[PDB]
């Protein structure tokens, strides 16, 4: 199958890493960063 689900990609808002589907969130950046 092929499912397309995204929580928060690069450039999104998030308070923690868990909040970001990519797990690239930072307390300073507050946004998913590569």
In three-state form (DSSP H/G/I as H, E/B as E, the rest C), the secondary structure along 1-34 is: CCCCCCCCCCCCECCCCCCCCCCCCCCCCCECCC
Distances in Å between the Cα of 27 and the Cα atoms of 1, 2, 3, 18 are 35, 32, 30, 12
Q: Are 13 and 7 in contact (CB under 8 A)?
A: no
Nearest Cα neighbor of 13 from 2, 21, 5 is 21
Residue 3, domain extent: 1-34
Surface-to-core class of residue 4, CB atoms within 10 Å of its CB (0-12 exposed, 13-18 middle, 19+ buried): exposed
The length of the chain in residues reads 34
> Using alpha carbons only, what angle is made at residue 17 by residues 11 and 21, rounded to the nearest 5 degrees?
65
Number of domains in the chain: 1
Count of alpha carbons within 13 angstroms of residue 14, beta-carbon side: 20
């Amino acid at each position: 199958s092929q499912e397309q689900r995204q929580c928060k990609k690069i450039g999104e808002h998030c308070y923690v890493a868990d909040e970001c589907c990519s797990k690239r969130c930072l307390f300073y950046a507050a946004k998913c960063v590569s």
